[PDB]
Design an enzyme around this catalytic site. Structure first.
Site, mmCIF file in Angstrom:
data_model
loop_
_atom_site.group_PDB
_atom_site.id
_atom_site.type_symbol
_atom_site.label_atom_id
_atom_site.label_comp_id
_atom_site.label_asym_id
_atom_site.label_seq_id
_atom_site.Cartn_x
_atom_site.Cartn_y
_atom_site.Cartn_z
ATOM 1 N N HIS A 300 30.263 35.354 39.707
ATOM 2 C CA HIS A 300 30.782 36.714 40.310
ATOM 3 C C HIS A 300 30.781 36.501 41.893
ATOM 4 O O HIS A 300 31.808 36.478 42.616
ATOM 5 C CB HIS A 300 30.180 37.834 40.123
ATOM 6 C CG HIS A 300 30.852 38.952 40.625
ATOM 7 N ND1 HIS A 300 31.787 39.986 39.765
ATOM 8 C CD2 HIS A 300 30.892 39.560 41.995
ATOM 9 C CE1 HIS A 300 32.255 40.854 40.418
ATOM 10 N NE2 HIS A 300 31.891 40.967 41.707
ATOM 11 N N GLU A 301 29.677 36.201 42.588
ATOM 12 C CA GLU A 301 29.759 36.262 44.008
ATOM 13 C C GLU A 301 30.387 34.947 44.461
ATOM 14 O O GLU A 301 30.956 34.823 45.471
ATOM 15 C CB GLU A 301 28.227 36.339 44.474
ATOM 16 C CG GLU A 301 27.368 37.510 44.179
ATOM 17 C CD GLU A 301 28.338 38.919 44.219
ATOM 18 O OE1 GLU A 301 29.015 39.041 45.285
ATOM 19 O OE2 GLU A 301 27.890 39.755 43.621
#
Ligand code: ARG
Ligand code: MG
Ligand code: ZN
Length: 888
Positions: A300-301
């Site tokens: 995600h990041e």
């Protein structure tokens, strides 16, 4: 002051460069800042107003000329106003020195101390707590950041981008200077100072052959928990390369774990900062779930680097543009990495429980809100998770080749810029025109997915004509009007469908996507040789309530024979829901009418057989099996019931589980025993680079079965519980704690698992959750015990959330008709709000369903919320939340 989406207007100012000196001492941090600024073409001679919250001003200057309070500027602890007649009319420097105190910053926004690390968190509006800024995401600038600190306490100093200098400073200090060459909004600024240890690796990008240094950081004690995260990062980078053609754009990427963190993680450019619970794992000290969580949050990041960083937000109303899209990208990644259908199913499970509840609550918003008071209140499952389903539908509609084309256009057109949701729809529209070979095709109607709130209901009617071999599916869509829209409009809903021959269980057609763009339509299929059973919304192809209008017989056939994991799972869900609603109403009538005797509808015997059939199939997914023997989530059920009496629902679930167990418990026990060798095999136990998700699913299944067998007091099950507690896998020995709740051995295992847990911070938090979630009659006394003995005065969000949140899912006890569960959580919320408003609001989660409960419970919840609203110095965050939740 309310912000409205339609009111967006560019700033009258520009900030081109930010040069920061951040000097950390024990009892104060001094921040010097120079902004190289200009007047924008939108400037109309207004005052220059900076955001700046809780700053102590030492000096401010324009262009080497000191400004004077009360003459040239005013500051009220939230806004610094410099009167227009003192603002230059061309490029100028603004500079300031302020004092802040991370060591007393318990809100964990801006710059704060987390144990022995100094770290920042700036999204959404935290940067104004570090220094003066025009703190909004369309004010993009380049950053030159020096951090200084005591060398012995803070030997590692990090900020965004390339490190260009490190130097000694008299007094035992040192300094490090960073240059981030990429324009960014201030919310992406980060700094970290700590005694940090690391693992590192080198990654060479696929196309341009850039050498990238990968570092992951934690405090010394937990450095050995960093390895899986580093592996996950490499996977993420490879995936963005292979699927999307996207390469990382700096020489170095750092990930840092911190112990005190409000969100899960944060995508600061080149310097991603994590809740430790989403970065750190080891197989002897973490539950299975940690490995999926870390893969998810690292990916995600990382994916934010394009969807969020390189293409950023014009304003906060566009939040779903980065969060929805990034969640979608992470889902594709995770599904590819894990190779189990349970990855997709778990996301659907969360959407249809938590997000659907939200979307039918007074908090209902579209994925792009029209207004906010505190942006913090819109980091929601709606924005993230419905957002992701809206972003996923593009892929379903376009297919992979055209989807990739549209995404490419999005990136190409908006790279290095701010963007809005319209920009993304525009790009997808180009790919759509390309795919339909039709320059008049458009996705105008698709925009409604961004602006319209509420979950659509899609319902079905059927016709088969045997003579013509012709099958018709009539589809209707309906969204319930709400406070956001009086009149709801038909959405563009893709419905992936198959057809199953119920006689032989085979597929009758190539899977196809029906595009429903009207309120209703009829889709007809020719050359359908036998009456089929429809397999509807395969993969869960739109975020909707599905009303399949199928018989239980038909659902059972789908559950047994359909190829699509979601449809099988959903067919099971629907069978459960029919039964729950029937038995709920039966108990409810008996209670309301004070009957001396009554009947309950038995659980369908062919359904129970089908469960047996599936359980005994060694080729079926073990994770899938664990779903089929579990009733739907309470928060999914409540969407189908008005004025819910929670005690009656608890009796309903109990009855159903008992009926099924009376038939299946021996099979459950047999499986639990036979799964053991594969489930608990120690391959890879010493290898933090390899995770077998299938084997983890097997453990999940065994633990699910053990739970069912314990609730049922199956003969001699306690013996297996005790043995299970000696497993090396925490997932097993923590399970043994919670399933022991039903036995006199509970407190014995309580003590044993505490000692196993107490020396690892994150494992202790897992232990806390397990106790909180324990099915105990004395649970309130146990919570007090946790308060006095373990939690005490912690201000750590993980600790507070671990103790209270899982308990609020205790249908029987949290919803005690005395209201004492409600009063307990309200007190915690109010206490927490005095130092951490963000967490305080998170703790409000249980109240989201207040208006769905029976009249007494509604009143009790409402009383507690109005009480919270009366607290002196209540945060804007919590006040906004509770005023919205209670309809004003
Ligand atoms: N106000 C907040 N809760 N901020 C959390 C930021 C999380 C981060 N943007 C992410 O989703 O990866
Ligand atoms: Mg202050
Ligand atoms: Zn995100």
């Amino acid at each position: 002051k309310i912000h409205y989406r339609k009111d967006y207007k560019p700033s009258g100012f520009i900030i081109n460069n930010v040069t920061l000196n951040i000097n950390i001492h024990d009892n104060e941090t001094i921040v010097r800042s120079v902004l190289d600024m200009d007047i924008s073409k939108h400037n109309v001679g207004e005052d220059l107003v900076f955001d700046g919250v809780g700053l102590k001003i030492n000096e401010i200057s324009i262009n080497n000329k000191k400004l004077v309070e009360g003459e040239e500027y005013t500051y009220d602890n939230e806004f610094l106003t410099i009167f227009s007649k003192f603002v230059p009319k061309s490029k100028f420097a603004f500079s300031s020195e302020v004092i802040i105190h991370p060591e007393t910053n318990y809100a964990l926004t801006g710059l704060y101390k987390s144990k022995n690390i100094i770290v920042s968190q700036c999204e959404a509006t935290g940067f104004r707590r570090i220094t003066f800024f025009i703190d909004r995401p369309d004010m993009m600038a380049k950053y030159d950041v020096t951090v200084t600190a005591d060398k012995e306490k803070y030997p590692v100093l990090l900020s965004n981008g390339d490190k260009v200098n490190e130097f000694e400073i008299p007094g035992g200090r040192h300094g490090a200077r960073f240059n981030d060459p990429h324009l960014k909004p201030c919310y992406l600024f980060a700094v970290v100072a700590g005694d940090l240890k690391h693992l590192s690796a080198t990654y060479i990008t696929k196309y341009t052959k850039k050498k990238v240094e990968l570092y992951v950081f934690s405090e010394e004690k937990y450095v050995s928990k960093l390895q899986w995260a580093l592996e996950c990062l490499k996977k993420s980078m490879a995936f963005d390369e292979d699927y999307f053609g996207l390469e990382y754009d700096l020489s170095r990427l750092n990930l840092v774990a911190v112990s005190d963190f409000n969100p899960g993680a944060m995508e600061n450019k080149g310097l991603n900062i994590f809740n430790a619970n989403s970065l750190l794992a080891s197989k002897k000290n973490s539950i299975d779930f940690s490995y999926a969580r870390i893969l998810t949050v690292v990916g995600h990041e990382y994916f934010h680097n394009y969807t969020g960083n390189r293409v950023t937000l014009r304003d906060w109303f566009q939040l779903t543009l980065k969060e929805g899209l990034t969640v979608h990208r992470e889902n594709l990644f995770s599904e590819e990495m894990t190779k189990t259908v349970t990855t997709r199913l778990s996301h659907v499970d969360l959407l249809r429980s938590v997000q659907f509840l939200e979307d039918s609550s007074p908090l209902s918003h579209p994925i792009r809100p029209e207004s906010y008071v505190s942006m913090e209140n819109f980091y929601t499952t709606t924005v993230y998770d419905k957002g992701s389903e809206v972003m996923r539908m593009y892929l379903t509609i376009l297919g992979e080749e055209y989807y990739k084309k549209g995404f490419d256009i999005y990136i190409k057109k908006n790279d290095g810029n701010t963007a809005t949701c319209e920009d993304f729809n525009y790009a997808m529209e180009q790919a759509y025109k390309m795919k339909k070979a039709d320059n008049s095709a458009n996705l105008n109607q698709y925009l409604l997915w961004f602006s319209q709130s509420g979950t659509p209901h899609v319902s079905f009617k059927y016709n088969y004509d045997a003579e013509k071999k012709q099958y018709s599916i009539h589809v209707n869509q309906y969204t319930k009007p709400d406070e956001n829209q009086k009149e709801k409009k038909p959405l563009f809903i893709p419905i992936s469908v198959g057809l199953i021959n119920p006689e032989n269980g085979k597929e009758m057609i190539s899977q196809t996507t029906l595009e429903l763009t009207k309120e209703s339509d009829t889709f007809v299929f020719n050359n359908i040789a036998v009456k089929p059973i429809p397999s509807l919304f395969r993969g869960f192809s739109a975020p909707v309530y599905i009303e399949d209008n199928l018989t239980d017989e038909e659902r059972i056939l789908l559950l047994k024979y359909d190829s699509d994991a979601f449809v099988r799972y959903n067919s099971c869900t629907n069978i459960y829901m029919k039964q729950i609603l029937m038995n709920y109403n039966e108990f409810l009538k008996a209670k309301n009418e004070k009957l001396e005797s009554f009947n309950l509808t038995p659980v369908n015997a062919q359904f129970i057989d089908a469960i047996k059939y599936l359980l005994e199939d060694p080729h079926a997914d073990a994770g899938f099996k664990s779903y089929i023997v579990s009733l739907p989530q309470d928060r999914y059920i409540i969407n189908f019931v008005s004025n819910l009496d929670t005690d009656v629902l608890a009796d309903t679930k109990e009855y159903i589980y008992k009926q099924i167990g009376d038939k299946l418990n021996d099979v459950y026990y047999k499986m639990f025993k036979s799964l053991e060798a594969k489930a608990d095999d120690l391959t890879y136990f010493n290898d933090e680079s390899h995770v077998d998700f299938d084997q983890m699913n097997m453990r999940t299944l065994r633990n699910t079965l053990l739970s069912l067998l314990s609730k049922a007091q199956y003969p001699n099950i306690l013996n297996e519980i005790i043995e299970h507690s000696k497993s090396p896998y925490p997932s097993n020995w923590l399970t043994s704690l919670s399933v022991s709740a039903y036995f006199d051995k509970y407190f014995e295992l309580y003590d044993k698992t505490y000692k196993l847990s107490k020396d690892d911070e994150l494992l202790l938090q897992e232990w806390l959750k397990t106790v909180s979630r324990s099915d105990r009659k004395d649970i309130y006394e146990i919570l007090k015990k946790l308060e006095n003995e373990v939690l005490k005065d912690s201000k750590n969000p993980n600790d507070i959330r671990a103790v209270y949140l899982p308990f609020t899912n205790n249908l029987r006890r949290f919803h005690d008709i005395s209201g004492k569960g409600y009063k307990l959580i309200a007190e915690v919320i109010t206490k927490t709000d005095k130092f951490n408003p963000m967490v305080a609001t998170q703790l409000c989660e249980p109240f989201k369903l207040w208006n769905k409960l029976d009249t007494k419970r509604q009143e009790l919840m409402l009383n507690e919320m109005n009480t919270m609203l009366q607290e002196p110095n209540i945060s804007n965050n919590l006040k906004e939340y509770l005023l919205r939740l209670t309809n004003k």
